[PDB]
Amino acid sequence: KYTTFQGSQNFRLRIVLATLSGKPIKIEKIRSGDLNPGLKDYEVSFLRLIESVTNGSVIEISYTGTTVIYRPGIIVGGASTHICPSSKPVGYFVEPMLYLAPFSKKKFSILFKGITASHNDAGIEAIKWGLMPVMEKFGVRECALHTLKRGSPPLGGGEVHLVVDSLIAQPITMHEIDRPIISSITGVAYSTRVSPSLVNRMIDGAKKVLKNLQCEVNITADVWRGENSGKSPGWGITLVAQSKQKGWSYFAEDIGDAGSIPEELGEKVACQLLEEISKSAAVGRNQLPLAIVYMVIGKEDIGRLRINKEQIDERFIILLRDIKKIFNTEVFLKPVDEADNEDMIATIKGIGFTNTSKKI
Amino acid sequence: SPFGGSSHAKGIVLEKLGIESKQPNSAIRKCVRVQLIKNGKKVTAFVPNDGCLNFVDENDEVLLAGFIPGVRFKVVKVSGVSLLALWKEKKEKPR
Amino acid sequence: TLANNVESKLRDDLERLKKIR
Amino acid sequence: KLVHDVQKKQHRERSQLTSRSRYGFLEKHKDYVKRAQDFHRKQSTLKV
Amino acid sequence: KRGGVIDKRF
Amino acid sequence: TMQRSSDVNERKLHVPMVD
Amino acid sequence: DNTVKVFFLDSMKFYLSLYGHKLPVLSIDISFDSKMIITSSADKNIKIWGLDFGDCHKSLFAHQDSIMNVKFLPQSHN
Amino acid sequence: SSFEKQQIEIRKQIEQLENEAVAEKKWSLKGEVKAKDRPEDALLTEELEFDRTAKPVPVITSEVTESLEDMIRRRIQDSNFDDLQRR
Amino acid sequence: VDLEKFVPYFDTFEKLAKKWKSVDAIKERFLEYDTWYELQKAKISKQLEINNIEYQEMTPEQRQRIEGFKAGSYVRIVFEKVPMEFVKNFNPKFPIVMGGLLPTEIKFGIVKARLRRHRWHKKILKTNDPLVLSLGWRRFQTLPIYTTTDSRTRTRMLKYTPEHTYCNAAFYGPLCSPNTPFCGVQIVANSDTGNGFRIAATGIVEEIDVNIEIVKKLKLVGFPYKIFKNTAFIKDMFSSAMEVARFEGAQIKTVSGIRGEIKRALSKPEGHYRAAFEDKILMSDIVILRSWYPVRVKKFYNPVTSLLLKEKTEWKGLRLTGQIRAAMNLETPSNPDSAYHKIERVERHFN
Amino acid sequence: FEARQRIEEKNKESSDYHAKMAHIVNTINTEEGAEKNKYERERKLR
Amino acid sequence: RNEHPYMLADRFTDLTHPELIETQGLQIDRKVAIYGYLHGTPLPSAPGTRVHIAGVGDFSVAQIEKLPDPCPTPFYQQKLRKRLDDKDKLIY
């Protein structure tokens, strides 16, 4: 019957893997003890987004909202428009949509409207230079997230258009047992409704920490102005460590709130990315929940991904646990032969998943 | 020589580029993209008619012979059976 | 009686027309 | 010449309905053009 | 459009 | 002989499969 | 230089700088709630910058001559 | 047995679908149809897509107006008149 | 702690700033085959050579956990909730075959296949006619609907399979990956085998989804009764003037081909309307309006389960439209008007 | 209303159809014809 | 054949308790064990995998375990330009 789990924990993850599997899923006990129980607007809106792109799926939310029964349909997609509630930005909905984009009947051309950045959710550049490049490694050749207008909190109103012009049967088998060498560090500095000196003070704060390194740095000074620069002033930084050898990338991001010194938050993202590097072996823990799931839906072949000691935390475990019930796939780990570092090799297999929803 | 010295060349049927065409028996409806196996180069080939277009499917072996100007290759032979034999109801394609 | 039935059928057509529109 | 004998099969024409028998023969494209052309011959002669 | 959103929330 | 060798080299080619 | 920099007085560190003044600011002004910065300039235009992001809500060419000094009504946005 | 009970439900469906096969077709599924054959005003009950032979006559909505006087303001702003002049 | 917070947990400023006063501990991270066929074969082989290596490295218990039970292993499988009759009506001669099912196989819904009448089958197949298909490991009976694209403008319901070509077929049943071919048979019981070739159709499954939008063509017919040159009045096309109001301006045409329009409905009598044509029509003309009405796929599923029977060779399900008529002694329906007759044309002489 | 959206959907689809059909006949003719012309002049050279 | 796991049953056995056959009757659902050599892709070790038995219906594997090869091939049996030995050939 229905695989039954508890809580809102990993809510999106448990629907999309259900969607990828085709196995129906039940989630119950969504904050039963809270004063305001049941699903919130953003995660109801997200569950609506799935119905827009999936076809034949039936979704029921309980009388109190504390239980949802999800039977997935085939993934069909198309041109559509979604209203992101002000609670969460577009990035909350686009990241899980990347889990499902390349495996559809017709192409995903979806317009997302609402806030575009938050302290807790992925920004545009996290998806653009931080999460998408992992798609070119996985076989998804051409795919883009076009920014037409950005909207900062609390009023938001931003616009982002997702296009995934690649559709593939399944992700390519994965082979990365080496710690990629980073060649250069790039990034984007952005702001709404405020003077460009902020975006320069962003870079100077970011520049200060990382000139102890011997690297070439080119942080884009980008300033949106006019009608397409949001209904609220706001700003944030995204610095990406880029490896041209095997096309690997690591990124860090956060946005500035009221009363913050720019050099301070510029100093953050430089040292913030810098901290992320120490804890990453082949992909960062902000790319880890992307790489593992696609490898689980690859072809019936074992690939290797190198993962660091710091990567395997509570996030790695429950995420691994969630995959097992839906797929019965288990991720084994074998130590590296090297003694300089204690990095780990995670061996996973695809379930033989294929894009049966495609026009052939 | 178009095949580099051979009279025939096999390929891999990637996608039928003329399926969406409205006009029946248009010159486009008989065009198929094919990967030449010996070198992997993508090429376009002719199938004799839309009736024969039914027989060709994606990931089948196809032999190509010299012939929408520019499509110099025609599909003469598919998956253990020649198309004209299939087209004449003289044979079934083996799978 | 028959005229009343035609009137009721016409009214049903009206409600369905509202449903379409 | 990749057309077979079957696709060149004759398509037979229908006739007037029995209920409509009293109105005459059921006319078709080739019947209509014959009366269309003669009227055009007629108006042209009336026109001049 | 096939499949429907059957929302029972009060 | 080159024309034959081309004709025999081509007939050896097939679709890649996994057994 | 036609830019009005803001220093935190307690921390003594520079927070934000007003930009876009055509001519130098003759008077500077902080709302009662302290969330707005009203500035009157020799360019004869008054700009009102919000503290949280240092952003001008409106720029106003009030006086045909330059506005030397600008006052508040205490505990009021006026 | 449950499997036999499965045939119990199957051998029901066979007879209705058998009856429908030999039953007279509905006026919708008869191809050519006539007003007497179908129920009166049946097409009022049904959605039928049909082609039209001429243009649908345009409707002067406000945005059609708004776009229209907007240009008229643009022509006169540029003094661009297609007007006949003394020759 | 949870993935909804995309930005993951990090340490405080001052500790992190003190942690990286220097950029040390990270300096390490920072700075031919003859034929394409051989390249693909090698890529397959290396992956296979990779596969063998870890499994050797893995423990035998670890290996079975990850790969499962490889082919060639002699294995015991236990099943529960098996039908009662299967053990009782067990014949060792009849083989028992087990087949694993991929996730798409479990799903049920509409199946779109490009299907043709099998070439040696005597008769063409009919829409809404039971047909036993063999998809994957499963063999079951359904009611397929045969359709055409009409020059890729719409999916139009065909009444039979084409005599000597493929056509699009829609039917309901367990789904499968595209490009999974299949075979069709009408009769499986020995009693009704006869001497006809039993394979009825052969085709390829084309697409999968949960519904199809098959439509059937409808022609509403009209008769003229009063003609003024291009303009004429038509009757019995519609039962009421309200019906005409819906189809005002609709394109209409005669059997002769003279195209027309529905100009306005006549108040008296009900259903009468005025139409203008490119030429004058004659009294014997019949005007027609082309229309389209949706068709639905019947959700019928009857797995063919011979091994559960005593006979194992006399399974029977839905009967063909021919057999039911024969059993109940009903003649095949026919319409005298629909019948075709020879036509001889008399040369016309005009005044 | 329904007519207006219906007709403009046909016009856009037809225009895209001819553009795609036109692009392909030009590109296939141009790129392949060069190689055909290439091979012929080698034959003349031989 | 290379994309699915499949199996031809060598023997057949019913594991239902005879007492259950009597207290309820023969009509009770029954537990069955089926042996043979696996083919095609590997079959997952964990129970619950969905399979189809031809002419029967779709079932879920309650339990699965490997047994020693009852017809060991000669190269395998001796392991535990030369012709086959008459002792080596076996029938099962």
With beta carbons less than 8 A apart as the criterion, state whether A53 and A104 touch.
Answer: yes
Element (H, E) at D5: none
| Same-domain pairing of A39 and A139 | yes
Give the residue from chain B lying closest to D6, CA to CA: B88
With beta carbons less than 8 A apart as the criterion, state whether A185 and A209 touch.
Answer: no
Task: Count CA atoms closer than 13 A to A37's CA, side-chain side.
Answer: 18
Distance CA I166, CA I204 (A): 10
For chains I and K, having 3+ Cβ pairs within 8 Å is answered yes
Closest to A296 measured CA to CA, from A16, A2, A73, A10: A16
Burial label, I140 (beta-carbon count in 10 A; 0-12, 13-18, 19+): middle
Closest to I280 measured CA to CA, from I223, I229, I233, I225: I229
F-K interface: how many C-beta pairs under 8 angstroms?
Answer: 3
Contact H52/J at CB under 8 A: yes
Contact A1/K at CB under 8 A: no
Containing structural domain, residue A167: 1-177+275-355
Between the CA of residue I302 and those of I87, I317, K10, K58, K59, what are the distances in Å?
A: 22, 8, 28, 13, 17
Give the residue from chain I lying closest to D18, CA to CA: I337
With beta carbons less than 8 A apart as the criterion, state whether I95 and K8 touch.
Answer: yes
Asked if the Cβ–Cβ distance from A198 to G16 is below 8 Å, we say yes
Asked if the Cβ–Cβ distance from G18 to A198 is below 8 Å, we say no
User: Of A238, A254, A274, which residue sits at a domain end?
Assistant: A274
For chains C and F, having 3+ Cβ pairs within 8 Å is answered no
Give the residue from chain F lying closest to K2, CA to CA: F19
For chains A and J, having 3+ Cβ pairs within 8 Å is answered no
Length of chain D: 48
With beta carbons less than 8 A apart as the criterion, state whether I274 and I224 touch.
Answer: no
Contact A227/I at CB under 8 A: no
Dihedral sign for Cα atoms in the order A85, A86, A89, A90: positive
**Geometric angle at alpha carbon K38, from K33 and K43, rounded to 5°:** 90
Contact I40/F at CB under 8 A: yes
What tokens appear for K53 in the block?
């038995």
| Same-domain pairing of A345 and A252 | no
Between the CA of residue H44 and those of B17, H53, I255, I293, what are the distances in Å?
A: 43, 21, 26, 13
| Same-domain pairing of A230 and A135 | no
Give the residue from chain B lying closest to F5, CA to CA: B6
Distance CA K70, CA K91 (A): 10
Tokens 């998956």 belong to residue: B79
| Same-domain pairing of A208 and A170 | no
Domain with residue A123: its CATH number is: 3.65.10.20
Between the CA of residue I348 and those of D20, D32, I343, what are the distances in Å?
A: 21, 11, 15
Count: domains in chain A: 2
Distance CA A271, CA A255 (A): 14
Give the residue from chain J lying closest to B45, CA to CA: J28
Distance CA I19, CA J26 (A): 63
**Geometric angle at alpha carbon A85, from A80 and A89, rounded to 5°:** 85
| Residue A170 domain flag | yes
Set of chain K residues whose Cβ sits within 8 Å of the Cβ of F19: 2
Phi, psi of A224 (to 5 degrees): -90, 135
Distance CA A315, CA A296 (A): 17
Closest to K4 measured CA to CA, from A3, I77, I176: I176
With beta carbons less than 8 A apart as the criterion, state whether I148 and I158 touch.
Answer: yes
> What distance in Å separates residue K29's CA from the closest CA in chain F?
39
Element (H, E) at K61: strand K57-67
Between the CA of residue F13 and those of F16, I32, I36, what are the distances in Å?
A: 9, 17, 9
Contact I257/D at CB under 8 A: yes
Distance CA I252, CA I230 (A): 13
Q: Pairing state of beta strands I156-158 and I145-148? A: antiparallel
From the candidates I140, I145, I157, I218, which should be mutated to test the interface with H, based on the most H CB atoms within 10 A? Answer: I218
For chains F and G, having 3+ Cβ pairs within 8 Å is answered no
Could you give the residue ranges of the DSSP H alpha helices within chain I?
A: 13-19, 36-57, 60-67, 84-88, 103-106, 241-246, 321-328
Give me the amino acid identity at A95. E
Name the residue facing F10 among B12, B38, B59 (closest C-beta): B38
Between the CA of residue A313 and those of A316, A318, J23, what are the distances in Å?
A: 5, 9, 54
| Same-domain pairing of A118 and A243 | no
Paired residues of K11 in beta bridges: K35
Give me the amino acid identity at A322. D
Q: Pairing state of beta strands I215-228 and H32-33? A: parallel
Length of chain H: 87
Task: Count CA atoms closer than 13 A to A221's CA, side-chain side.
Answer: 13
| Residue A360 domain flag | no
Asked if the Cβ–Cβ distance from K66 to I69 is below 8 Å, we say yes
Length of chain C: 21
Domain with residue A188: its CATH number is: 3.30.360.20
What tokens appear for B86 in the block?
């299939």
Asked if the Cβ–Cβ distance from E1 to A59 is below 8 Å, we say no
Paired residues of A112 in beta bridges: A82, A160
Bond preceding residue A85 cis, omega within 30 of 0:
no
Closest to K52 measured CA to CA, from A42, F8, I27, I79: I79
Phi, psi of A299 (to 5 degrees): -80, 170
Between the CA of residue K46 and those of A26, I149, I235, what are the distances in Å?
A: 21, 46, 73
Distance CA A274, CA A210 (A): 8
| Same-domain pairing of A151 and A186 | no
| Same-domain pairing of A293 and A328 | yes
3-class DSSP state for residue F14?
A: coil
3-class DSSP state for residue K46?
A: coil
Distance CA H35, CA H56 (A): 27
Q: Pairing state of beta strands G55-60 and H32-33? A: unpaired
Q: What angle separates helix I36-57 from helix I60-67, to the nearest 10 degrees? A: 130
Give me the amino acid identity at G29. D
**Chain I partners (3+ C-beta pairs within 8 A):** A, B, D, E, F, H, K
| Residue A80 domain flag | yes
Give the residue from chain D lying closest to B47, CA to CA: D2
Q: Resolution in A, one decimal?
A: 5.9
For chains K and A, having 3+ Cβ pairs within 8 Å is answered yes
| Same-domain pairing of A299 and A348 | yes
For chain C, list residues whose CB is within 8 angstroms of any CB belonging to chain H.
9, 13, 16-17, 20
Distance CA A64, CA A62 (A): 5
Asked if the Cβ–Cβ distance from E7 to A60 is below 8 Å, we say yes
Paired residues of I222 in beta bridges: I287
Q: Terminal CA-to-CA distance of chain A, rounded, Å?
A: 32
User: Of A241, A274, A307, which residue sits at a domain end?
Assistant: A274
What tokens appear for I23 in the block?
């950029």
| Same-domain pairing of A6 and A53 | yes
Task: Count CA atoms closer than 13 A to I290's CA, side-chain side.
Answer: 12
| Residue A279 domain flag | yes
Q: Terminal CA-to-CA distance of chain C, rounded, Å?
A: 30
Set of chain K residues whose Cβ sits within 8 Å of the Cβ of F18: 2
Query: 3-class secondary structure for chain A?
Result: CCEEEECCCCHHHHHHHHHHHCCCEEEECCCCCCCCCCCCHHHHHHHHHHHHHEECCEEEECCCCCEEEEECCEECCCEEEEECCCCCCCHHHHHHHHCCCCCCCCCCEEEEEECCCCCCCCCHHHHHHHHCHHHHHCCCCCCEEEEEECCCCCCCCEEEEEECCCCCCCCCCCEECCCCCECEEEEEEEEECCCHHHHHHHHHHHHHHHCCCCCCEEEEECCECCCCCCCCCEEEEEEEEEECCCCEEEEEEEEECCCCCHHHHHHHHHHHHHHHHHCCCCCCCCCHHHHHHHHHCCCCCEEEEEECCCCCCHHHHHHHHHHHHHHCCCCEEEECCCCCCCCEEEEEECCCCCCCCCCC
Give the residue from chain A lying closest to E2, CA to CA: A56
Distance CA A181, CA A243 (A): 6
Name the residue facing I6 among A121, A349, A353 (closest C-beta): A121
With beta carbons less than 8 A apart as the criterion, state whether J17 and B22 touch.
Answer: yes
Distance CA A350, CA I66 (A): 11
**Chain A partners (3+ C-beta pairs within 8 A):** E, G, I, K
CB count within 10 Å of CB I279 equals 19
> What distance in Å separates residue F16's CA from the closest CA in chain K?
13
With beta carbons less than 8 A apart as the criterion, state whether I287 and I223 touch.
Answer: yes
Name the residue facing G13 among A194, A258, A261 (closest C-beta): A261
From the candidates B12, B17, B21, B22, which should be mutated to test the interface with I, based on the most I CB atoms within 10 A? Answer: B22
CB count within 10 Å of CB I81 equals 13
CB count within 10 Å of CB H76 equals 10
Phi, psi of A107 (to 5 degrees): -75, 150
Name the residue facing K29 among I81, I94, I95 (closest C-beta): I81
Set of chain H residues whose Cβ sits within 8 Å of the Cβ of I216: 28-29, 31
Name the residue facing A213 among I30, I51, I209 (closest C-beta): I30
Name the residue facing I44 among F9, F13, F18 (closest C-beta): F18
Contact A300/K at CB under 8 A: yes
| Same-domain pairing of A157 and A187 | no
Q: Which residues contact A269 (CB under 8 A, 6 or more apart)?
A: A187, A206, A237, A238, A239, A252, A253, A254
The full set of domain ranges for chain B reads: 1-95
| Same-domain pairing of A61 and A195 | no
Name the residue facing I37 among B20, B21, B38 (closest C-beta): B38
| Same-domain pairing of A89 and A228 | no
